[PDB]
RNA sequence: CUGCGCGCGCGCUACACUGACAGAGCCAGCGAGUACUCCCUUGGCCGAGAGGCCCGGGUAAUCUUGUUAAACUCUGUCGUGCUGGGGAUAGAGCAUUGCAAUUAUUGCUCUUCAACGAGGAAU
């Protein structure tokens, strides 16, 4: 995937999943920056799906 | 005085138009379903 | 002068409220509110940013004037806005001056004097009202009936302020604030 | 010294400046006309009477203002003048179409006192300026007659003066002692 | 004075504003009623007499009837239609109704019973071709919707006889009238006394919640001339 | 005695092409009356029959009434 | 209650006398 | 800046301007000391030497 | 050399600083004159010192005022404030202290506001 | 004595200067006046109907007082608020085309000038003239 | 029907009056010898003015 | 609509005259912001608007930004009428983000103009 909008530490990531129940089911998952950042997916977005 | 009738259970919506009402109702199901299915997964994944 | 309006430097020569109105002639008309009617340290516009909910009684210090403001701005969307509630008694008082030929602080002294009730009944029996409480209940019956009666109407509070303002002045039947206060005398009367 | 005059046409009155001579203020607050706009001669204060009998009287500044002081609908027919007394501030007169004039004090909600006598539509009137003449009211109806009445006793008229014509105006002169009833052709 | 001129035009009959305390009327209050959702249908001595009388409470207090025949005497009254009637009920629960003089209600206890139930769930009754609310819910005490130059009374039976006529009569110019009239079948007169100013009793004999409103506004027409 | 009242019955109701009730209100509040017809639209009628602002309905001529009416009609004919 | 208990007292006293 | 005594004086205080505030400085404030560029008022007759030489 | 007295004024946040030197009679807030800047009703919140000490205490001197923070009512009252300490802190350094207790004793019987700035602190009923 | 426009209250200054641009009758009112309305922000347009001059004699003023403004800066100061109905309101900028196009009007009859120097526009020498004697006229009636 | 000023002497402490009610021993200020104690709601002091419109009764708990 | 176990909770917006609208006055404070880059953006045109475009200052108490913010203040318009209070729902159009906008990301324009007349008992 792709981030959308940069904060501080949380970012947004965009073209990953396709709906909110595939971020559901990869809730809490490792994501991984290729840099190096680790994360960890926190919440399914609602109002781009 | 010109009087009017009334309109009319808590438990049921009134709408004329069935297309309508049957279009809300659908989308409330599918919301209920929706809810409950996403409780289920996020509880299977903790 | 250092830098004065016209209006000003005519009226330079006493405190005068809005600076067009005097605080010299003025009698309250009751014995018993004229320890809890300030109008002895005189005051320019009702906006002064003083201490007066610390402790007890200390709204007995505060120029009426200011309570009336204060009371002005009762309800849920008015609540912050004071320079609304300092325009309407501006205009309120311009109002009353245009219809009576009077003058505004004699008219609204004498109609909080009016307006106190007397006696009130408690949950019932019959008991008397203390001074500070009729002061209390005087401008919140004239400041409710104020906006009670210009709230779907075309008039605005500052009409009806100085329309109930002058009813009250006058002591009769077409005001709130004196309805409610013979209602309550009159309940007070009933249960003795 | 003021600089406001009002001119009244259909249904909105207008006060106008003498310096400038411009329409300064144009109050259109009536539902059907406005008979006559005449202002205190305090200069604040402008009164009015409608076509369907209510008369509103309201508070003007210098500038842009009509606040409304009071309205009085007893007339229930329309008002054609309405007039304040030169020497007291509260007190106004009122001829109406029906039969009545009546005199009413600003703070009280009820008529002060009540003239008829007329058998007509009664159109113009005036008070009485002067020392002596504290308390006379002239006013002249379609019926060709101009009768003067005292305030203090609310009979009929004082005096009665019949025409030929259908009297259209008054006016007293300053010394008090003549009138000018204009009827007709004369 | 002037001989007032003829109205050549019938007169409309507008009813009071709500922000009007200027005007002269009369006010009903029919206090404890019973008005109870059963499941959905009130809670009357029609079907539900042999639920109560299982339960052992009181068969004779569950009577809206008593409710719908004064409601309905009072809105055919002509003290309504001239429009110087405003009423309100007060139910058992603490509910308390202001009723619409431009409302005209159904005749008919089923009808009225299912349009009962609709406002107790619902909080008001819309008409059907105006918005304007007809039987609107509206909050306690009833002293925040009665007017400030008032006399509570309370229609009883220990209180001293007075003739309607004269005590209307003692009515002042601007003062209107509220009546407390209990709607209830058997019960004593405490239900009022926080409210009402003096209890008065118009015959000696006792009568129906129905014919008492009747007798009352019949003499309030008698004494305003309507 | 005898003064013009050529204008002085003027408080009464007028018919258009629509709406059978138009009194007086005044030139461009009388003109939102009609159904369809808006707040800011009917601004833009007014200017360009040289009608008034100030004037009310009901102080128009038999001539100047019926040059809002044609108006009406066909909005594309007058330019906009 | 006590004001009202002793006032109570000395009426049955001033009876009593 | 947490642990600063409010009665402190250097003695350089007297021979430099301070941060200020947003209100005495103006829309010119920074919260850095400003320092001189090395010019200087210049007397009138050393001005009278240059200007005969330019 | 010259006769200059810099006080400053305090509200919530709402700060300012009069510069009063000996000059004609003018008072200028922001570059803009007294009478100029505030809200329209608040305009008499700033006269009130001068018309409590009377003018011919400001005839003698010219007030310049920087405000900055606050709304419009916490700067009219640092205003207020600014012109009061201003013009007593004059007359404290240039002309006989017993004007300068004159002056204190006129705006400490009128508001003692003018004169000390009274912070809101945070203490309710412990 | 001697005058400037800072010596003169805003509304009776801006309305006397309304007053002068329109009785002139040089101006340039575009044509989309009237039809337009003023921000997005807004609700009904202006009521004055011819209001060009309100606007001309406070940009004008406004640009007098200070260096050199821009057209981002009249949109950014002639904007409030739009309610966005149920939504919380925001600033909004206000339109670019009144802003740009009274500039432009006033350029054209010399009373403000481009200042492409350090950008913006800067009040023009002979605006300060005519404005310094329209604040002086104003004070002339008081 | 008078009506009667009077004036506070003393506020009263442990009556045990209902609530925001308050007794108060007031001496009169026509004769102002006579003092009875009367019930007073709202907040009251020592040495303020009250109106009263019956005098003839003593003020119970 | 999150959460807890058509039902529920936190909310936003209103029911107007201490108001809506339209001019006009005009005032903060805590922030942030672009390197191996496209961040914060002034001003100049164009555009009704949203926006477009040409340049420009800033790695920053230095430029945006005095963040000319909003309630608010004034002079007007409207007049108690679901009214110009309210702005849901809906049609048609133009834009911006993005590889992508249908199930309408958001923005603007016209139009459509619902419920809601102070929330009941309780808590």
Same mark, same amino acid.
């Given at each position: 995937?792709?981030?959308?909008?940069?904060?501080?530490?949380?970012?947004?990531?965009?073209?990953?999943?396709?709906?909110?129940?595939?971020?559901?089911?990869?809730?809490?998952?490792?994501?991984?920056?290729?840099?190096?950042?680790?994360?960890?997916?926190?919440?399914?977005?609602?109002?781009?799906? | 005085?010109?009087?009017?009738?009334?309109?009319?259970?808590?438990?049921?919506?009134?709408?004329?138009?069935?297309?309508?009402?049957?279009?809300?109702?659908?989308?409330?199901?599918?919301?209920?379903?929706?809810?409950?299915?996403?409780?289920?997964?996020?509880?299977?994944?903790? | 002068?250092?830098?004065?309006?016209?209006?000003?430097?005519?009226?330079?020569?006493?405190?005068?409220?809005?600076?067009?109105?005097?605080?010299?002639?003025?009698?309250?008309?009751?014995?018993?509110?004229?320890?809890?009617?300030?109008?002895?340290?005189?005051?320019?516009?009702?906006?002064?940013?003083?201490?007066? =909910?610390?402790?007890?009684?200390?709204?007995?210090?505060?120029? @009426?004037? #200011?309570? %009336?403001?204060?009371? $002005?701005?009762?309800?849920?969307?008015?609540?912050?806005?004071?320079?609304?509630?300092?325009?309407?008694?501006?205009?309120?008082?311009?109002?009353?001056?245009?219809?009576?030929?009077?003058?505004?602080?004699?008219?609204?002294?004498?109609?909080?004097?009016?307006?106190?009730?007397?006696?009130?009944?408690?949950?019932?029996?019959?008991?008397?009202?203390?001074?500070?409480?009729?002061?209390?209940?005087?401008?919140?019956?004239?400041?409710?009936? =104020?906006?009670?009666?210009?709230?779907?109407?075309?008039?605005? @509070?500052? #009409?009806? %302020?100085?329309?109930? $303002?002058?009813?009250?002045?006058?002591?009769?039947?077409?005001?709130?604030?004196?309805?409610?206060?013979?209602?309550?005398?009159?309940?007070?009367?009933?249960?003795? | 010294?003021?600089?406001?005059?009002?001119?009244?046409?259909?249904?909105?009155?207008?006060?106008?400046?003498?310096?400038?001579?411009?329409?300064?203020?144009?109050?259109?607050?009536?539902?059907?006309?406005?008979?006559?706009?005449?202002?205190?001669?305090?200069?604040?204060?402008?009164?009015?009477?409608?076509?369907?009998?209510?008369?509103?009287?309201?508070?003007?500044?210098?500038?842009?203002?009509?606040?409304?002081?009071?309205?009085?609908?007893?007339?229930?027919?329309?008002?054609?003048?309405?007039?304040?007394?030169?020497?007291?501030?509260?007190?106004?007169?009122?001829?109406?179409?029906?039969?009545?004039?009546?005199?009413?004090?600003?703070?009280?909600?009820?008529?002060?006192?009540?003239?008829?006598?007329?058998?007509?539509?009664?159109?113009?009137?005036?008070?009485?300026?002067?020392?002596?003449?504290?308390?006379?009211?002239?006013?002249?109806?379609?019926?060709?007659?101009?009768?003067?009445?005292?305030?203090?006793?609310?009979?009929?008229?004082?005096?009665?003066?019949?025409?030929?014509?259908?009297?259209?105006?008054?006016?007293?002169?300053?010394?008090?002692?003549?009138?000018?009833?204009?009827?007709?052709?004369? | 004075?002037?001989?007032?001129?003829?109205?050549?035009?019938?007169?409309?009959?507008?009813?009071?504003?709500?922000?009007?305390?200027?005007?002269?009327?009369?006010?009903?209050?029919?206090?404890?009623?019973?008005?109870?959702?059963?499941?959905?249908?009130?809670?009357?001595?029609?079907?539900?007499?042999?639920?109560?009388?299982?339960?052992?409470?009181?068969?004779?207090?569950?009577?809206?009837?008593?409710?719908?025949?004064?409601?309905?005497?009072?809105?055919?009254?002509?003290?309504?239609?001239?429009?110087?009637?405003?009423?309100?009920?007060?139910?058992?629960?603490?509910?308390?109704?202001?009723?619409?003089?431009?409302?005209?209600?159904?005749?008919?206890?089923?009808?009225?019973?299912?349009?009962?139930?609709?406002?107790?769930?619902?909080?008001?009754?819309?008409?059907?071709?105006?918005?304007?609310?007809?039987?609107?819910?509206?909050?306690?005490?009833?002293?925040?919707?009665?007017?400030?130059?008032?006399?509570?009374?309370?229609?009883?039976?220990?209180?001293?006889?007075?003739?309607?006529?004269?005590?209307?009569?003692?009515?002042?110019?601007?003062?209107?009238?509220?009546?407390?009239?209990?709607?209830?079948?058997?019960?004593?007169?405490?239900?009022?006394?926080?409210?009402?100013?003096?209890?008065?009793?118009?015959?000696?004999?006792?009568?129906?919640?129905?014919?008492?409103?009747?007798?009352?506004?019949?003499?309030?027409?008698?004494?305003?001339?309507? | 005695?005898?003064?013009?009242?050529?204008?002085?019955?003027?408080?009464?109701?007028?018919?258009?092409?629509?709406?059978?009730?138009?009194?007086?209100?005044?030139?461009?509040?009388?003109?939102?009356?009609?159904?369809?017809?808006?707040?800011?639209?009917?601004?833009?009628?007014?200017?360009?029959?040289?009608?008034?602002?100030?004037?009310?309905?009901?102080?128009?001529?038999?001539?100047?009434?019926?040059?809002?009416?044609?108006?009406?009609?066909?909005?594309?004919?007058?330019?906009? | 209650?006590?004001?009202?208990?002793?006032?109570?007292?000395?009426?049955?006293?001033?009876?009593?006398? | 800046?947490?642990?600063?005594?409010?009665?402190?004086?250097?003695?350089?205080?007297?021979?430099?301007?301070?941060?200020?505030?947003?209100?005495?400085?103006?829309?010119?404030?920074?919260?850095?000391?400003?320092?001189?560029?090395?010019?200087?008022?210049?007397?009138?007759?050393?001005?009278?030497?240059?200007?005969?030489?330019? | 050399?010259?006769?200059?007295?810099?006080?400053?004024?305090?509200?919530?946040?709402?700060?300012?600083?009069?510069?009063?030197?000996?000059?004609?009679?003018?008072?200028?807030?922001?570059?803009?004159?007294?009478?100029?800047?505030?809200?329209?009703?608040?305009?008499?919140?700033?006269?009130?010192?001068?018309?409590?000490?009377?003018?011919?205490?400001?005839?003698?001197?010219?007030?310049?005022?920087?405000?900055?923070?606050?709304?419009?009512?916490?700067?009219?009252?640092?205003?207020?404030?600014?012109?009061?300490?201003?013009?007593?802190?004059?007359?404290?350094?240039?002309?006989?202290?017993?004007?300068?207790?004159?002056?204190?004793?006129?705006?400490?019987?009128?508001?003692?506001?003018?004169?000390?700035?009274?912070?809101?602190?945070?203490?309710?009923?412990? | 004595?001697?005058?400037?426009?800072?010596?003169?209250?805003?509304?009776?200054?801006?309305?006397?200067?309304?007053?002068?641009?329109?009785?002139?009758?040089?101006?340039?009112?575009?044509?989309?006046?009237?039809?337009?309305?003023?921000?997005?922000?807004?609700?009904?347009?202006?009521?004055?109907?011819?209001?060009?001059?309100?606007?001309?004699?406070?940009?004008?003023?406004?640009?007098?007082?200070?260096?050199?403004?821009?057209?981002?800066?009249?949109?950014?100061?002639?904007?409030?608020?739009?309610?966005?109905?149920?939504?919380?309101?925001?600033?909004?900028?206000?339109?670019?085309?009144?802003?740009?196009?009274?500039?432009?009007?006033?350029?054209?009859?010399?009373?403000?000038?481009?200042?492409?120097?350090?950008?913006?526009?800067?009040?023009?020498?002979?605006?300060?003239?005519?404005?310094?004697?329209?604040?002086?006229?104003?004070?002339?009636?008081? | 029907?008078?009506?009667?000023?009077?004036?506070?002497?003393?506020?009263?402490?442990?009556?045990?009056?209902?609530?925001?009610?308050?007794?108060?021993?007031?001496?009169?200020?026509?004769?102002?010898?006579?003092?009875?104690?009367?019930?007073?709601?709202?907040?009251?002091?020592?040495?303020?003015?009250?109106?009263?419109?019956?005098?003839?009764?003593?003020?119970?708990?």
């Amino acid at each position: 995937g792709t981030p959308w909008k940069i904060f501080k530490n949380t970012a947004f990531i965009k073209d990953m999943f396709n709906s909110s129940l595939e971020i559901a089911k990869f809730e809490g998952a490792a994501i991984r920056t290729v840099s190096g950042i680790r994360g960890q997916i926190k919440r399914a977005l609602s109002k781009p799906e | 005085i010109k009087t009017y009738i009334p309109k009319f259970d808590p438990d049921k919506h009134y709408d004329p138009n069935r297309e309508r009402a049957e279009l809300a109702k659908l989308k409330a199901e599918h919301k209920r379903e929706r809810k409950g299915a996403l409780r289920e997964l996020r509880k299977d994944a903790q | 002068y250092d830098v004065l309006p016209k209006e000003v430097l005519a009226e330079v020569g006493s405190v005068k409220l809005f600076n067009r109105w005097s605080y010299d002639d003025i009698e309250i008309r009751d014995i018993s509110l004229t320890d809890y009617i300030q109008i002895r340290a005189p005051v320019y516009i009702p906006h002064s940013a003083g201490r007066y =909910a610390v402790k007890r009684f200390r709204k007995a210090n505060c120029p @009426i004037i #200011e309570r %009336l403001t204060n009371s $002005l701005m009762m309800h849920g969307r008015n609540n912050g806005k004071k320079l609304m509630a300092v325009r309407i008694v501006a205009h309120a008082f311009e109002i009353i001056h245009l219809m009576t030929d009077q003058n505004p602080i004699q008219v609204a002294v004498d109609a909080i004097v009016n307006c106190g009730p007397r006696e009130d009944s408690t949950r019932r029996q019959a008991v008397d009202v203390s001074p500070l409480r009729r002061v209390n209940q005087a401008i919140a019956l004239l400041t409710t009936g =104020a906006r009670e009666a210009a709230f779907r109407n075309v008039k605005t @509070i500052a #009409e009806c %302020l100085a329309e109930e $303002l002058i009813n009250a002045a006058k002591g009769s039947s077409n005001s709130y604030a004196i309805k409610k206060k013979d209602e309550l005398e009159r309940v007070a009367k009933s249960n003795r | 010294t003021n600089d406001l005059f009002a001119v009244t046409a259909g249904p909105r009155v207008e006060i106008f400046s003498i310096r400038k001579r411009e329409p300064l203020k144009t109050i259109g607050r009536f539902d059907s006309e406005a008979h006559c706009g005449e202002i205190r001669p305090d200069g604040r204060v402008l009164v009015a009477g409608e076509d369907t009998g209510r008369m509103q009287v309201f508070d003007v500044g210098q500038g842009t203002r009509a606040v409304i002081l009071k309205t009085w609908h007893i007339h229930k027919q329309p008002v054609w003048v309405t007039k304040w007394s030169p020497t007291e501030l509260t007190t106004l007169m009122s001829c109406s179409d029906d039969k009545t004039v009546r005199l009413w004090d600003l703070p009280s909600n009820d008529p002060t006192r009540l003239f008829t006598g007329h058998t007509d539509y009664v159109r113009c009137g005036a008070f009485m300026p002067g020392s002596a003449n504290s308390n006379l009211l002239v006013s002249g109806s379609y019926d060709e007659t101009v009768r003067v009445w005292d305030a203090r006793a609310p009979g009929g008229a004082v005096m009665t003066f019949k025409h030929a014509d259908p009297i259209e105006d008054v006016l007293p002169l300053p010394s008090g002692t003549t009138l000018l009833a204009a009827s007709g052709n004369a | 004075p002037p001989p007032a001129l003829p109205q050549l035009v019938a007169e409309q009959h507008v009813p009071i504003p709500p922000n009007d305390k200027d005007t002269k009327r009369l006010i009903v209050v029919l206090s404890n009623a019973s008005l109870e959702t059963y499941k959905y249908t009130l809670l009357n001595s029609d079907e539900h007499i042999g639920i109560m009388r299982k339960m052992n409470r009181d068969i004779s207090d569950a009577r809206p009837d008593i409710t719908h025949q004064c409601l309905l005497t009072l809105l055919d009254s002509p003290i309504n239609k001239a429009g110087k009637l405003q009423i309100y009920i007060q139910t058992a629960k603490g509910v308390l109704i202001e009723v619409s003089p431009t409302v005209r209600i159904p005749r008919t206890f089923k009808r009225f019973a299912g349009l009962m139930v609709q406002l107790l769930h619902r909080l008001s009754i819309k008409g059907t071709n105006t918005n304007e609310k007809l039987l609107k819910v509206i909050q306690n005490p009833i002293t925040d919707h009665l007017p400030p130059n008032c006399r509570k009374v309370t229609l009883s039976f220990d209180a001293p006889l007075v003739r309607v006529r004269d005590y209307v009569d003692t009515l002042g110019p601007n003062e209107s009238i509220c009546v407390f009239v209990g709607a209830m079948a058997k019960g004593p007169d405490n239900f009022a006394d926080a409210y009402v100013d003096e209890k008065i009793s118009i015959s000696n004999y006792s009568l129906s919640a129905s014919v008492a409103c009747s007798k009352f506004c019949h003499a309030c027409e008698d004494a305003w001339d309507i | 005695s005898l003064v013009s009242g050529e204008k002085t019955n003027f408080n009464h109701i007028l018919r258009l092409l629509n709406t059978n009730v138009d009194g007086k209100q005044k030139v461009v509040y009388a003109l939102t009356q009609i159904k369809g017809v808006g707040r800011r639209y009917s601004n833009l009628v007014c200017k360009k029959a040289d009608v008034d602002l100030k004037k009310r309905a009901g102080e128009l001529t038999s001539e100047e009434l019926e040059r809002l009416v044609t108006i009406i009609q066909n909005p594309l004919a007058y330019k906009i | 209650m006590a004001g009202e208990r002793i006032a109570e007292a000395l009426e049955l006293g001033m009876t009593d006398l | 800046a947490a642990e600063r005594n409010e009665d402190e004086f250097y003695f350089g205080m007297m021979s430099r301007k301070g941060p200020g505030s947003a209100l005495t400085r103006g829309k010119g404030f920074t919260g850095t000391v400003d320092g001189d560029r090395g010019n200087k008022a210049l007397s009138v007759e050393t001005v009278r030497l240059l200007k005969t030489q330019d | 050399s010259v006769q200059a007295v810099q006080v400053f004024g305090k509200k919530k946040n709402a700060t300012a600083v009069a510069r009063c030197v000996q000059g004609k009679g003018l008072i200028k807030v922001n570059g803009k004159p007294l009478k100029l800047f505030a809200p329209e009703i608040l305009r008499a919140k700033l006269y009130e010192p001068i018309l409590i000490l009377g003018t011919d205490k400001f005839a003698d001197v010219d007030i310049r005022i920087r405000v900055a923070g606050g709304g419009h009512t916490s700067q009219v009252y640092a205003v207020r404030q600014a012109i009061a300490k201003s013009i007593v802190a004059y007359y404290a350094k240039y002309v006989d202290e017993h004007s300068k207790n004159l002056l204190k004793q006129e705006l400490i019987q009128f508001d003692r506001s003018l004169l000390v700035a009274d912070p809101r602190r945070c203490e309710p009923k412990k | 004595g001697g005058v400037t426009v800072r010596d003169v209250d805003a509304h009776k200054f801006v309305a006397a200067y309304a007053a002068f641009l329109k009785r002139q009758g040089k101006l340039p009112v575009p044509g989309w006046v009237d039809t337009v309305k003023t921000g997005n922000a807004k609700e009904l347009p202006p009521q004055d109907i011819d209001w060009w001059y309100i606007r001309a004699a406070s940009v004008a003023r406004h640009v007098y007082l200070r260096k050199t403004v821009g057209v981002g800066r009249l949109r950014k100061v002639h904007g409030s608020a739009k309610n966005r109905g149920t939504r919380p309101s925001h600033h909004v900028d206000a339109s670019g085309s009144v802003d740009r196009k009274i500039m432009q009007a006033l350029e054209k009859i010399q009373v403000l000038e481009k200042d492409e120097e350090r950008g913006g526009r800067r009040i023009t020498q002979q605006g300060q003239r005519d404005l310094d004697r329209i604040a002086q006229t104003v004070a002339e009636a008081d | 029907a008078p009506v009667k000023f009077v004036k506070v002497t003393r506020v009263l402490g442990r009556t045990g009056s209902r609530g925001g009610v308050t007794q108060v021993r007031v001496e009169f200020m026509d004769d102002t010898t006579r003092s009875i104690i009367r019930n007073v709601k709202g907040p009251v002091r020592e040495n303020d003015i009250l109106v009263l419109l019956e005098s003839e009764r003593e003020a119970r708990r």
